[PDB]
Amino acid sequence: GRVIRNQRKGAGSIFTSHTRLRQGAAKLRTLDYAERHGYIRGIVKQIVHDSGRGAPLAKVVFRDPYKYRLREEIFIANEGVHTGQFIYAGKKASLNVGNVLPLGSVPEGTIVSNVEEKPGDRGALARASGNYVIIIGHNPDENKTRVRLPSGAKKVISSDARGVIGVIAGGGRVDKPLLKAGRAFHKYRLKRNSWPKTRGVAMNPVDHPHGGG
Amino acid sequence: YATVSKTHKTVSRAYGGSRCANCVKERIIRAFLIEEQKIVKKVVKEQTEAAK
């Protein structure tokens, strides 16, 4: 039969992401000596909207430890973080909202976001708006940390993996009805070509396993 | 801007051009007060170490 859209999407082409207006990839700092041993201070310069993303982003400026210059990082803003705020990242950073800490430095019941799946990948878990990870417990002998994920899954991560204290901002977004095809249209114009969706039953037998009748 | 004299592009003050008068005033005030507070913190910590 004819190749279906589910198979046609993998070739790329007209299904690639629409990334013209995106602010940049939202990552933590590269895990360096300062964050491995002490802490480094940055300043929140602006909080911006990123096209195609529910969560707002924060632009945080740090000083380069090896060269006289500034370095700008793009974080996902946690709720309560404001412009002009001092953010502290590292092993020795305090337990305050917006700070970047290793999981082994936080107690049980701590709520984190943008959690690293492995130490150094610069954030993989709980990045969408309103989502967070809970620290279940520690296994200090294995240098491991048990966490609970937004899906309900329990995971074991290295205790050197980092996370941002607090919950991703922008929560409650999906509770408002769109009401309109046009609003769904503008939602997907900034993300990718997956809308509108034609039902497989609605098709001829050649186009889909479900077609015909 | 390359066709005009320096008078048209600056004002006679520190950061004249780049920064406005109130922002310049704020960074002057903050620089002074923070350096004084750093002296205070070093004094307090030295007293704390001397007694401890």
Binding site: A34, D64, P65, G90 | -
Partner: protein, 224 residues
């Protein structure tokens, strides 16, 4: 001096820009440098079979110095003085020459025919199979031999860049006693001293961090 002040710099985390430091340990070397260093490291780390590993036991400094002093008296005839000999022989129309024998095929033939008084074998020959059979051959034929450090040193001996082997076959009467004394010295210092340990495997060496890990774990097991 009233005009000078002390302004010590804080180079802690979150402070002044770090000063320049020696980063020789972290240099991203070129690929050929990395290959040659890792190849030497691998030759150390792997377990080395005895026929290869015997080439780590060479003549000592003093014995090598005396040996090369002996061989430099029999450095072969050069290309500049060969032409002088030929013109003199055309006028006559020359005694028997004394020289160091060199060349792998030639020296192997001399060992097999037992014409070699003393054989020097370079340790750093690549491919190593060119010389890896030579010590057993010399032992089987009853020829004194010594493994020496430097094919380039042997090349200086025989007017070349490198030389895998060198051999003394015939010596002058002024040096027969020196040759015999050197053969006795080599027998006492090289062949007898390293006779057992040449039958051992080599290369049982761990890296620095792996050794530290093993030492820490053994200490932790032995004491708590």
């Amino acid at each position: 001096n009233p005009l000078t002040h002390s302004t010590p710099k804080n180079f802690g985390i979150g402070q002044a820009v770090q000063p320049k430091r020696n980063l020789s340990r972290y240099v991203k070397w070129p690929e050929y440098v990395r290959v040659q260093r890792q190849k030497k490291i691998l030759s150390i780390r792997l377990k080395v079979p005895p026929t290869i590993a015997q080439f780590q036991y060479t003549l000592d400094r003093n014995t090598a110095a005396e040996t090369f002093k002996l061989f430099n008296k029999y450095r072969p005839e050069t290309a500049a003085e060969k032409k002088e000999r030929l013109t003199k022989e055309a006028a006559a129309v020359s005694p028997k020459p004394y020289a160091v024998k060199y060349g792998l095929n030639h020296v192997v033939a001399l060992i097999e025919n037992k014409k070699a008084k003393l054989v020097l074998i370079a340790n750093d020959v690549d491919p190593i199979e060119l010389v890896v059979f030579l010590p057993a051959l010399c032992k089987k034929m009853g020829v004194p031999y010594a493994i020496v450090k430097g094919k380039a040193r042997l090349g200086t001996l025989v007017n070349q860049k490198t030389s895998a082997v060198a051999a003394l076959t015939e010596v002058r009467a002024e040096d027969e006693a020196a040759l015999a004394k050197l053969v006795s010295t080599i027998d006492a210092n090289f062949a007898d001293k390293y006779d057992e340990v040449k039958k051992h495997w080599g290369g049982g060496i761990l890296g620095n961090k792996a050794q530290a890990k093993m030492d820490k774990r053994a200490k932790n097991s032995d004491s708590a």
